[PDB]
Amino acid sequence: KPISIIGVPMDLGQTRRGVDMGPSAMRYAGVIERLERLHYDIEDLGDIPIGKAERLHEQGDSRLRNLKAVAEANEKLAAAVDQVVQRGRFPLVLGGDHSIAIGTLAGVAKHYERLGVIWYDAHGDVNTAETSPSGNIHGMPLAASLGFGHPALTQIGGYSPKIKPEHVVLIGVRSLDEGEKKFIREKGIKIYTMHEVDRLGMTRVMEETIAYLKERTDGVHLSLDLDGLDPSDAPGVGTPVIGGLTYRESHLAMEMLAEAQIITSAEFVEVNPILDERNKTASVAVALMGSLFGEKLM
Amino acid sequence: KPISIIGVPMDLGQTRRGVDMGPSAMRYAGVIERLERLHYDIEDLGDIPIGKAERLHEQGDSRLRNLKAVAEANEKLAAAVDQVVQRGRFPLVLGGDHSIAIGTLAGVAKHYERLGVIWYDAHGDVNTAETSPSGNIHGMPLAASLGFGHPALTQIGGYSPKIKPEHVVLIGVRSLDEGEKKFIREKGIKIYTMHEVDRLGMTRVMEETIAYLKERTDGVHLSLDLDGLDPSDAPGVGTPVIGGLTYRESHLAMEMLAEAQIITSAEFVEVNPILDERNKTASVAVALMGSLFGEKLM
Amino acid sequence: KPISIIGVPMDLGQTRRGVDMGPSAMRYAGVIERLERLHYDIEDLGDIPIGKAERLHEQGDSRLRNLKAVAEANEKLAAAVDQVVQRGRFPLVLGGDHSIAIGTLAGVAKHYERLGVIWYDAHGDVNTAETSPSGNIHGMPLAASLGFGHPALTQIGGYSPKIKPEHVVLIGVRSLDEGEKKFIREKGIKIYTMHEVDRLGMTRVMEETIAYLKERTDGVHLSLDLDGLDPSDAPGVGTPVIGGLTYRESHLAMEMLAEAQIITSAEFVEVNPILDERNKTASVAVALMGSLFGEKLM
Amino acid sequence: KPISIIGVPMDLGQTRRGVDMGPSAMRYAGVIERLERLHYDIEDLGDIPIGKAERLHEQGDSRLRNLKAVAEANEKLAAAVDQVVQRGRFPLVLGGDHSIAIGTLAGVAKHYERLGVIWYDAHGDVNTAETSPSGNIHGMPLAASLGFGHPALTQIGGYSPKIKPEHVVLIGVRSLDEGEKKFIREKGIKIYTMHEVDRLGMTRVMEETIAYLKERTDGVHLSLDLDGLDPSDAPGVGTPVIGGLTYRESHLAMEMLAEAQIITSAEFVEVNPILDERNKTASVAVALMGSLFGEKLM
Amino acid sequence: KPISIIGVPMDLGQTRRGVDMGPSAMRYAGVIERLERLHYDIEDLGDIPIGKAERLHEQGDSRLRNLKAVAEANEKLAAAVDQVVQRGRFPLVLGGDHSIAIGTLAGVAKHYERLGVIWYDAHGDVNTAETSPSGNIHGMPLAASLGFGHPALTQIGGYSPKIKPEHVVLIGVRSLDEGEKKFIREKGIKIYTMHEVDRLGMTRVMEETIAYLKERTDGVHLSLDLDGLDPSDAPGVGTPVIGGLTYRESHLAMEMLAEAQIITSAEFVEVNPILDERNKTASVAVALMGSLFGEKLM
Amino acid sequence: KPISIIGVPMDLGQTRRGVDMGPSAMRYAGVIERLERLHYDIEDLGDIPIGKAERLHEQGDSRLRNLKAVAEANEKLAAAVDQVVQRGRFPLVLGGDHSIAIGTLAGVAKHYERLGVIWYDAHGDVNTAETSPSGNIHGMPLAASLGFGHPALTQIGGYSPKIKPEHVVLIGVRSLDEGEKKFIREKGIKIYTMHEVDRLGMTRVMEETIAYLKERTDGVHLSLDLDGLDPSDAPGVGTPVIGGLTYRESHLAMEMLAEAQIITSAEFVEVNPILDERNKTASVAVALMGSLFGEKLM
Ligand SMILES: [Mn+2]
Ligand SMILES: [Mn+2]
Ligand SMILES: [Mn+2]
Ligand SMILES: [Mn+2]
Ligand SMILES: [Mn+2]
Ligand SMILES: [Mn+2]
Ligand SMILES: [Mn+2]
Ligand SMILES: [Mn+2]
Ligand SMILES: [Mn+2]
Ligand SMILES: [Mn+2]
Ligand SMILES: [Mn+2]
Ligand SMILES: [Mn+2]
C-alpha cells in the first residue's frame, strides 16, 4: 500500500520549543529515501499549518494550554489523514508533540469498525484537564481519543470516541501520574510497563500484543513516542525518562509488527532536534520506520 | 512495616576515601522523600560514629587493615540494628563500604531461626585475613558473617555464625580470587555469576533465588553493593568491574523481591560520591530502594 | 535604534540539510527575550520564503549549485532588508547558510557611501564558480558582494558592487583555497587569520579592525559565521575547522564592537541544529548578539 | 608561617545540598599532603559544627534563608579563625558555600588596620535581604562584610564593618544582578569582569590588583569561589556560569599572589562533590592552593 | 592443547589504515598474560611479513584491490597455520582485516574431514569480484573459502573449497548487500542476524549453533570480526554498524563455546587502534579470548 | 631543503607499550601528503630496526632500563641521521619515545659548530641513572646529550657532548623532579615553564627563544614531545600532565619557527596510538609539522 507522509510541526501540546522541528529533522534523516529503497510509492504531502499561541491572559486554558490552536491544528490533520485513507494510502504522520495523535486518530478511526492502538511510550498520555499536573495536552491524546477530556479535543472530526479501551495496548511505560494509573486500571487498558518488558522480554510482549489485537480489531494504529526508548538511545525528546527500551528492542518490535502485517497507520512523535545530539533521535525514528515498513537484515 | 534508616559513614574497610560520604549522598538523592511517598512511616536515626583509623603497625595485623575501628563501628551498628528490629521496624542501613554488613547481620541474625542472605555484588566478599590479597575488610564481610575470619569480626554482637552457607545466594558476581572460588565451592554457597545472568536471564535468576530462600529461611537480608551494577550505570564505586548488571535488571530484581515479600532487612553499600558523576550512583541506589519497598510503574 | 529580525531558512547555498532550521533554533534560544531585556524595540518580521531545489539534470548549475533558488531568495531578502533600513531600523538577519549575505548586503549597501564589512569566519567565502572546489554558493557571498562572480549573484538588488575590498576585514580565518588566497592577496583585503589572533591577541585584532574601518566607512556590516568559533564551542555548523576562536574571544569582539558603536547591520549564519549538541550553537549566537547589542557584565 | 585548616561543611547559605561535602572532598583530594610537600607546618583543626535548618514555616525572614544557623555557624568559625591568627598561624578555610566568608572575615579583619580582599568569583555576592532575589545568604557575604545587610550577618564577631570597599577587588565576575551592579558602582569597588580579563589578560589584571592592594592594605584575604573558573574546569559548583576563568589563568593568578607575598588568609568555597565529575573541582582547588602557597614549576 | 599465536598486520583487504596495528594492540592488551594465567602453553610466533601494495594504476583487477599482496600474505599465513596444526597446537590468529581468514582457513581446513565455521560478524563477507561494490577483499573471505571468487583467493593453499556451506553459521549479521543475501539464501548458509538474536536471545542462538555444528563437523573454526559487537563496545573497527552484539552477549557466546569444547582454531580480526578509544577494542578482544579458552567467573 | 623521514618504533625508553606505533600512526595521519603539498622533495627512509629488550637482570642496571637495546638503536639512528645530513637533506625523525633524541642529536650535532636545541615538552628530561626515579631512559635524553649520564648514552656517535647548556631552551615545562630543577638551575639552561607561557604569552616566549638562539647557534634542533601539549589536545602520550600548551599555541610556535628559518632538524616523539582517541595525537603532530615546514593560513 502506498504511503503518504504528513508533517505536523506542532509544539503547542507541551512547553519545550523545538519539537515543531521534528518533521523536517526526520525528513533530513532520510525518511523518503529509506522508504523508497523498499520500493514504496511514497508521497510527501508537506506540513499542516499550525497556529501561534494566543496571549496567556487572553484565552482560557492553563489546565488545557493552547487548546484552540491545538484543536484547530488537529482538525486540519484529521481532514488530511481522512483524505489519505480515502485515497487508499497508508498515512504516516511525523510530529510534533503527541497531541497530534488526536488528529491522526480522528482521521483514521472512522474508517474502521474496531481500530486498535499500540501506544509505544514512556508515558500513558491518559490525563484530562482535571488530572493533568501540567496542563500540557500532549499528555492527554490517548484519553481524549477514548472519549475522555475536553469536548474541543474529544469531538475533533465530528465523532467520539475514536477507539475503545479494550483495543489499546501501552508498551514501554515507566512514568504514570496516579490519576493515569487509576484511568488505565479502571478502563481496563492492556499495558506492558518496563517491568513486564524486563520480566517477559520484548519478544513475548510483542507476541501477546499482536495476538491480542489481531484477535479483536480490523486495523491497528501505531503511535510511537520516541521517549519510549531510553534517553541514551533517543536523547532529543522533551520528557525523557531513564530505564527505557533499547534501540534493538525497538527494531525487534517494528520487525515483528511488519511481520504480522497488522499496522494500518502510524505516527512518530516527540522528536526535538533542539534537545538532541546530532539528529540521533530523528535518525533512530527513520531506522524504526524502515523496519516497520518491511526492511529486513536478511 | 515502618522503616528506620541508619547511616554508617565508613571507609575503613577499604583504601579509597569518599565512601564515608555515601550515606549523605543517598540522603541528598532523596531517600526519605522517595519512601515517604510510598506511605511509609520512615525514621532517620542518623549516623554511627566511626573512629579514626589506628596506625597499622599497632592494629590487628597487616592482613586486616583498620581492624579495631572497623570492629568497634560494627559493634555500635549491631547494637543499633538490634534495637530497630526489637522495635518492630525494618532496618535500612546506608553505607559506607561493605565491611558494615558484619554489624548489620550481627544486629539482625539473632532475631531469626534461619536468616537468608542475597549478596548482590560483583564480588563474593568471602576472603579472610589469610586469603586476602589486600587486607581490606570490605572483602571479608560475607565470610566473617558465616563464622570464617578474625574473631574480632566473627564474634561481633556476641555470637557466631550469623547465617549458614546454604542460606546465602550471590548475584551478579564476576570477580573472585581463587581462594574465594574455593570457599564458595567448598561451603556450597549458591551463586549466579554474570554467566548465569546472561544465560538464564535475570527473571529466572530471581525466581530461583526467591524460591530457594523462601523454602528454607524465615527472613531474608538483602546486602546490595552498588558495584554489582555495571560501572556505566553505577560509576561511583571503589572497585568497579565491567560487564555488570544493568539499571533495568536491578529494578526488576528489586520489584520481584518486593512482590515476593521476603526481604526483612537491607543495606546499600559502596556508594562513593568522590568517584561518581553528579551523584548518579546514590540516585541509582535510591531508585532501587524505591522499587524494593513497593514502588510500581503501574 | 529599533531592530527588525528577518529569518532566512536557507540551506541551498551548501549541501548539508538542517541549516534552514538555524533561524528558529536561534528564536528558541531566546533571541527576542535577550534583546528585549536590553530595552530594545524589537520586531520579528518572520522568514523569507525559500524555494525548493529544482532537479539536477534540469537546471545548469554544478559550479553554482541551486543558483536560481539562491538568487531568488536573495532578491526577496534584499527587498526586505532595504525596507527595514528605510524604516530607520537595524536589520538583524538570522540564517541559514552564508549565501544569504548576498541579499543582506544588497539591501544594506545602497544606503551607505562606503559600507564596511567585518567577515567573522573560519573561511574567506571569496570563491567564484571558477575557483570553487565544491560549487557551494555559501563559499562565494563575499566575492559576489565585491562584484566578482555570476551576474545572477553580483547583480542582486540591481547594482554592483555592494562594497569595496579596502573596506572589508576578515577575522578568524584558517581555511582558504589557493584561489581565495590569491583573491584576498590581489584585491588587498585586510585579514586576520588565526595566526594573527594568536600572535597579536583578540584585543589588538579588534582595536586595529575598528580603527581601520571607523577611519574609512560610514557604516559597518557584521557578517558572523558561527564556524569562525572553534567546533568545541560551536559544533552545529556544516563546515567545522579546528583551532578556532574561543567563546570568550567572541564575546570580547562583540563587546568591543558594541563599545565602538560602528555596527549598523548584522547577520548570524550557518547555525545547523541537526549537527549541534542541544542547541549549543544557537545559544552561543544569541549570547553573542546580546553582547553586540550592548549587554555588559558590569 | 604555619597553616591551620578549618573545614566548614556548610550548605545552608544556598539551596543545593552537597556543598557541605566540600571540605572533605578537598581533604581527599590531598590538601594536607600537597602543603606538607612544600615544607609547611600544617595542622587540620577539623570541621565547624553546623546546625540543622529549622522548618521554613517557622523561620524569621524569607529574604534570609537559614539565617539563625548560618549566623550561628559563622560565629563559631569567626572564633576559630580568630584563635588561629592569635597563634600566629595562617587560617586556610575550606567550604562549604560562600556564606562562610562572613565568619572567616570576622575572625581575621579585627587583626588588621586595613585588610584587603580579593574576591575571585563569577558573582559579586553583594546582595542584601532587600535586594536578594533568592534569600540565599551565600549571595550576601561580601556586602555583609562591608557592613551592608542584616545585623545578624553584619555584626558577626561583635564588630562591623570588617573591610572597606576601596580595599576589595573582584576578579572574574560575569553574573551580577542589577542591584549588585548599583552596589559595586556606588561603593566604588574595584572589579575586573571577564571583559577586562579577556581585554587586558590575567597577567595585567593581577599586576594591577596586587599593586593596588599592596599600596593600601596591611593584609590581604583571598576568598576564592570555585565557580569563578569555567564550568568545564570546575563543574562541581552550585551556581555555574559559562565563559569563566581557565585552569591555567587560575594557576597564574595564584603563582603571582604567592610571588607577591601579600596573602595573609584564604578560603576555597562552593566545592560540591555531588554536582562534580570524579572530584575534579576539589582537585582543582587543591592544585590552586599548592600554587598559592609557593609551589613552582621550576 | 598448546596455543600458537600468529599475528597478521594486514590492512590491504580494505581501505582504512591502522588495522595492521591490530595484532600488537592485542599483544599490548595482554593476550599472552591472559592465556598464560589459564595455564596454557602459549607461544608467540610473531607476525607474517606483509608486502606493500603496488600502484593502483598498474594493478590487475579493480574489483580486487591489492590482490597480489593479499594473496601472497595469505599463502604465507596458510603455511604458518598448517605448521602449527601439524605440531598439534591450536592456531590463534590475530589480525589484521578479515581477508586473513582466507589464509587461516587454508592452513586449517586440510586437516579436517568436515570443518565447521562460526562467522561472528556484522557482515556476511560473501562478496566476489563480480558482486563487490568496493573491490575490498576483506568483504570476500567467506565466499572465497567456500570456493566462490577469484582463483587467486579460492586456491590459496593449493586446494578448494576449504569448507561446505552447510557447515557455516553466521552470527550477529546486520549489514548485507543484496548479492550477499542472495548468496546466503542460495547456498543455504545458516544465519542468525540481530533479528534472531533479539528474538531468540543469545543463549538459544548459541545452543542451536553448537548443536548444529557438533552434529556434522569434526572441528570448528571461530572467525570473529570485532565489528560484530556494537560500536559502543568495540569502536576501533573500520566498518562499524550500530545495533550490535553487547559485551555481555559476546562473553556468553565465548563461554558457551568453551563449555562445548568444539573450537579447534580461531582468529580475532578488524581491530584498528587508530579508530579506537584507548585500546578498548583490543582489550575487548583479549577478554573474549580469555572466555573462549576457559576463563570462568566461578 | 629536501626532507628525509626516519621512523624509530621505540618504546624501550619507558614502560608503556604502544609508543613504538607512533611512527606509523603519523604516517597514517598523512605526514608525507601534508609535506608534499608544500612542494617538498620528501623521502621516507623507513624505520630503524629496534631490538627486543634484554632481561633487566643482565642489562646495564636497575637505574637504566633496556640500556643496551636503547643504545644500539640510537647508534643506528645516529648513523642514519648523519647520512641524511651529509646528503644535504633535513632529517625529520618520528618516534617512538624521547630516548631517540640521543641518536638524533648524535647524528646532527657533529655537523654544527654550536647546535641549539628547543625542547618542547611538559618535562625537562634531564635525569641521569643516579637521579632517575624510574630508570626510564626517555627521561634522560637531554642530560645525556649535554654529556651527563651513562657513557653508553653520552658517547653515542663517538663524541660528547652534542650540545652546550647555554644553547638549550625548554618550552612548556610543568613537571620536574627536584634533581632536574637543580640540574637546570646549575647548568644555566634557559626555560619557559607554563608559568612564563601564561605570564608572557606564547608570542613573547617564542620571540625571546628565537632571538636567544639565533644569536648564539649556527643550527637549531627542535625536539617536540607531544606531551608538551595539554592532554585534552594530545591524549595519546605515556606521561600526560594537565595544564598544557593549547593546539593554537603550538601552531603559533611552529609558524614563528618556520618564519625565523632557524630549524635545521626536528623530531616528533611520544605519540602512543594505544593511549589515544582515534589518532588525534598523531594528527596533531602532523598538523604541527605542516606549520613548521611553512604551511600558512594565508
Ligand atoms: Mn506521548
Ligand atoms: Mn512520552
Ligand atoms: Mn561488596
Ligand atoms: Mn563489590
Ligand atoms: Mn561563511
Ligand atoms: Mn565558514
Ligand atoms: Mn561566591
Ligand atoms: Mn560565585
Ligand atoms: Mn568481517
Ligand atoms: Mn564485519
Ligand atoms: Mn620528553
Ligand atoms: Mn614529556
Q: Could you report how far apart the first and last alpha carbons of chain F are, in Å?
A: 22
For E116-128, give the secondary structure using H, E and C.
EEEEECCECCCCC
Identify the sign of the CA torsion A104, A110, A112, A116: positive
Q: Which residues in chain E are closer than 8 Å to A201, comparing Cβ atoms? A: 201
* Cα–Cα distance for residue pair A80/A4, rounded to 1 Å: 10
- The C-alpha torsion from D121 through D123 and D125 to D131, rounded to 10°, is 180
Distance D50 CA to ligand 7 centre (A): 19
Inter-chain CB proximity C194 and F249 less than 8 Å: no
Q: Which residues in chain F are closer than 8 Å to E279, comparing Cβ atoms? A: 18, 274-275
* Cα–Cα distance for residue pair F222/E83, rounded to 1 Å: 49
- Burial class, D274, CB count within 10 angstroms (exposed 0-12 / middle 13-18 / buried 19+): buried
Q: Could you report how far apart the first and last alpha carbons of chain D are, in Å?
A: 22
Q: Nearest 5°: phi and psi at C172?
A: 90, 5
Cβ within 8 Å of residue D59, ≥6 positions away: D65, D66, D67, D68
Query: Is F201's Cβ below 8 Å from some Cβ in D?
Result: yes
* Cα–Cα distance for residue pair D73/E170, rounded to 1 Å: 69
**For residue C12, which of C174, C238, C175 has the smallest C-alpha distance?**
C238
Any bridge partners for residue A3, and if so which? A42, A90
**Kind and range of the H or E run holding C268:** strand C263-269
Q: Give the C-alpha distances (Å, rounded to integers) separating D122 from B260, C185, C298, D224.
A: 53, 43, 12, 10
The residues of D carrying an active-site annotation are 98, 121, 123, 125, 138, 225, 227, 270
DSSP code of F229?
Answer: B
Among D17, D28, D275, beta carbon nearest to B274: D28
D residues 181..200 contacting C (CB < 8 A)? 181, 184-185, 191, 193-195, 198-200
* Cα–Cα distance for residue pair C268/C23, rounded to 1 Å: 9
Inter-chain CB proximity E278 and F279 less than 8 Å: no
**For residue B285, which of B298, B260, B297, B267 has the smallest C-alpha distance?**
B267
Nearest ligand to the C-alpha of residue F97? 11
Structural contact between residues D95 and D5, judged by C-beta atoms closer than 8 angstroms: no
Chains B and C touch (3+ CB pairs under 8 A): no
Whether B121 is catalytic is yes
**How close F72 comes to chain D (CA, Å)?**
33
Chains F and C touch (3+ CB pairs under 8 A): yes
Q: Nearest 5°: phi and psi at F236?
A: -80, 65
**How close D194 comes to chain F (CA, Å)?**
17
**For residue B227, which of B138, B156, B149 has the smallest C-alpha distance?**
B138
**For residue D285, which of D30, D99, D7 has the smallest C-alpha distance?**
D30
H helices of chain C, where? 22-28, 31-37, 67-86, 101-109, 141-145, 151-154, 178-187, 194-200, 202-214, 247-260, 280-292
**For residue C78, which of C144, C11, C1 has the smallest C-alpha distance?**
C144
* Cα–Cα distance for residue pair F71/F152, rounded to 1 Å: 6
Structural contact between residues C163 and C157, judged by C-beta atoms closer than 8 angstroms: no
The catalytic position among E20, E47, E82, E138 is E138
Q: Which residue has the cell 510534533?
A: A96
The catalytic position among C11, C75, C225, C267 is C225
Q: Do the strands C115-120 and C219-225 form a parallel or antiparallel pair, or are they unpaired? A: parallel
Structural contact between residues A164 and A117, judged by C-beta atoms closer than 8 angstroms: no
* Cα–Cα distance for residue pair C265/C273, rounded to 1 Å: 24
Query: Is A242's Cβ below 8 Å from some Cβ in B?
Result: yes
Chain B contact partners (≥3 CB pairs within 8 A): A, D, E
Cell of D41: 607546618
Whether C41 is catalytic is no
* Cα–Cα distance for residue pair F18/F238, rounded to 1 Å: 9
∠ CA E173-E178-E184 to the nearest 5 degrees? 55
DSSP code of E178?
Answer: H
Q: Do the strands B3-8 and B90-95 form a parallel or antiparallel pair, or are they unpaired? A: parallel
What does the domain layout of chain C look like in residue ranges? 1-298
Q: Which residues in chain C are closer than 8 Å to F256, comparing Cβ atoms? A: 199
Cell of F228: 608538551
**How close B174 comes to chain E (CA, Å)?**
5
Structural contact between residues A140 and A125, judged by C-beta atoms closer than 8 angstroms: yes
Q: Which residues in chain C are closer than 8 Å to F255, comparing Cβ atoms? A: 195
Structural contact between residues C282 and C110, judged by C-beta atoms closer than 8 angstroms: no
Reported resolution, Å: 2.2
C residues 23..62 contacting A (CB < 8 A)? 24-25, 27-28
Cell of C203: 584585543
H helices of chain D, where? 22-28, 31-36, 67-86, 101-109, 141-145, 151-154, 178-187, 194-200, 202-214, 247-260, 280-292
Give exposure, F98-108, as e/b (b: 16+ Cβ within 10 Å).
bbbbbbbbbbb
The string of DSSP letters for B237-282 reads -SS--SS-B-HHHHHHHHHHHHHHT-EEEEEEE---GGGSBTTHHH
H helices of chain F, where? 22-28, 31-37, 67-86, 101-109, 141-145, 151-154, 178-187, 194-200, 202-214, 247-260, 280-292
**How close A167 comes to chain B (CA, Å)?**
19
* Cα–Cα distance for residue pair D153/F170, rounded to 1 Å: 52
Chain C contact partners (≥3 CB pairs within 8 A): A, D, F
Whether F138 is catalytic is yes
- If you classify domain B1-298 with CATH, what class do you get? alpha beta
Beta carbons within 10 angstroms of residue A52's beta carbon = 8
B81 is annotated as contributing to ligand binding: no
Structural contact between residues B95 and B269, judged by C-beta atoms closer than 8 angstroms: yes
**Residue E109 CA to its chain's centroid (Å):** 14
Q: Nearest 5°: phi and psi at C147?
A: 95, 15
Which amino acid is it at F227? D
Whether F121 is catalytic is yes
- Please give all residues whose CB falls under 5 A of ion ligand 1, grouped by chain where several chains appear: A 98, 121, 125, 225
Among F17, F25, F275, beta carbon nearest to E274: F25
* Cα–Cα distance for residue pair E256/E203, rounded to 1 Å: 8
**How close A283 comes to chain E (CA, Å)?**
12
B270 is annotated as contributing to ligand binding: yes
Which amino acid is it at C212? Y
Cell of F134: 624510574
Q: Which residues in chain F are closer than 8 Å to D297, comparing Cβ atoms? A: 173-176, 193-195
Structural contact between residues C36 and C5, judged by C-beta atoms closer than 8 angstroms: no
Q: Could you report how far apart the first and last alpha carbons of chain E are, in Å?
A: 22
Q: Which residue has the cell 562513593?
A: B272
Structural contact between residues A29 and A286, judged by C-beta atoms closer than 8 angstroms: yes
Which amino acid is it at C4? S
Any bridge partners for residue D91, and if so which? D4
- Burial class, B264, CB count within 10 angstroms (exposed 0-12 / middle 13-18 / buried 19+): buried
Q: Give the C-alpha distances (Å, rounded to integers) separating E185 from B282, E126, E191.
A: 51, 11, 9
Structural contact between residues E277 and E233, judged by C-beta atoms closer than 8 angstroms: no
* Cα–Cα distance for residue pair A138/A153, rounded to 1 Å: 11
Give one word for A99, left, alpha or beta, with left for phi > 0 and alpha for psi -120 to 50.
Answer: alpha
Chain A contact partners (≥3 CB pairs within 8 A): B, C, E
Inter-chain CB proximity A201 and B202 less than 8 Å: no
* Cα–Cα distance for residue pair A232/A234, rounded to 1 Å: 6
* Cα–Cα distance for residue pair B171/D107, rounded to 1 Å: 54
Cis geometry, peptide bond prior to residue F161 (ω within 30 degrees of 0): yes
- Burial class, C179, CB count within 10 angstroms (exposed 0-12 / middle 13-18 / buried 19+): middle
Q: Do the strands C115-120 and A3-8 form a parallel or antiparallel pair, or are they unpaired? A: unpaired
